[PDB]
Each structure stands twice: as structure tokens, then as C-alpha cells.
């Protein structure tokens, strides 16, 4: 549960990636290899990159970091009410590309660090705030259906 008031923080500040989402999900999908170098052994397509340049250079990468921007961009727009959206992604990150939920954490620190980066002046204390509890909520939920479809790290 986070407030109205949140959830109007959350949409707002997610304004500014929807004006820019390969962009964005780029340098999150970067920010992630470089920071959790493990999680890029989960990527075929990507584990033959072996710089932040070959990355960056990566129209792959690019494309892939807007479908998870897109992809998560349409759970958030639900205000929680996101269970449609959530299960087919919880059903291929668990069965298919069997994604441990501490990688959900990863990517979530990713999400801030990128909005922080880019957005100093929108990205304040209070959109910070609201940001956390909304992808605190979203790896909450993927856990949980993990639980029930049976898996879980
Ligand atoms: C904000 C969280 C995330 C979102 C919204 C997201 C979304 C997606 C989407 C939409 C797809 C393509 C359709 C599907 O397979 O479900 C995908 C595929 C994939 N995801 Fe994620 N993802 C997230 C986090 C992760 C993390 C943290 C990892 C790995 C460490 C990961 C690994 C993969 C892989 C390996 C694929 C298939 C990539 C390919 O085409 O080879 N995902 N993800």
C-alpha cells in the first residue's frame, strides 16, 4: 500500500523515462552489469560484452532495456492493481530465465540510481520515497507468485 499522494509521486517522476524510455533502460540494464556482474550470466545475448563500451555500444542491450522499461512502466500505471500484468512476468523469471529475487532487488537499485543520475532536480527526497515502496511492493508481489508457482531464491 502506498498513498495516493505516492503513487502520484511514482507516475510523475515516471513522466520523465516515458520522454526517453531506451534511454533509460540502457543505462539501467549498464548500471546492473557493472554493478552485479554475476547477473549479466543470465544473458546469452549479452555475455561476450566485456566493457561498458561494447554495452553501450550493444543496440541489443537497447532494445531490451526499453521492453523492461515498457514492461514495467505498464505495472506501475496499475497502482497495484497489477496482477495481470505481474503473472506472466513472474511465470518466465521464474520457470523460464529462473531469476532469483535478489536480482529483482538488484535491478530495483539500478531503477533509483539511473532516476538519481538523471534527474537530480525531479528525483528529490519525496519522489525517492515513493519510488522505493513502489518497486519494494512490485518485487514483493513477483515473490510471492514465485512462492505459489513453487520456486524461490
Ligand atoms: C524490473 C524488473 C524486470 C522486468 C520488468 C523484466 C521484464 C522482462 C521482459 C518484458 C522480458 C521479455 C518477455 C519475458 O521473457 O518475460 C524479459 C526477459 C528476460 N529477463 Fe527480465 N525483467 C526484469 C528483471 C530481470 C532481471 C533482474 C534479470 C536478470 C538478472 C532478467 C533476465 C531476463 C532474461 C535472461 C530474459 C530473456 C532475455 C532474452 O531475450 O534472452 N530480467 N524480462
Known sequence: ????????????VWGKVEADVAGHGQEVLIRLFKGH???????????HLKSE???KASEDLKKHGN???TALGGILKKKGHHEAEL?????????????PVKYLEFISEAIIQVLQSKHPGDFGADAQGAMSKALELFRNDMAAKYKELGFQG
Open 1 to 12: 500500500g502506498l498513498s495516493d499522494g505516492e503513487w502520484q509521486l511514482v507516475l510523475n
Open 37 to 47: 556482474p554475476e547477473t549479466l550470466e543470465k544473458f546469452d545475448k549479452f555475455k
Open 53 to 55: 563500451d561494447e554495452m
Open 67 to 69: 521492453t523492461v522499461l
Open 87 to 99: 503473472t506472466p512476468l513472474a511465470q518466465s523469471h521464474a520457470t523460464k530465465h529462473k531469476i
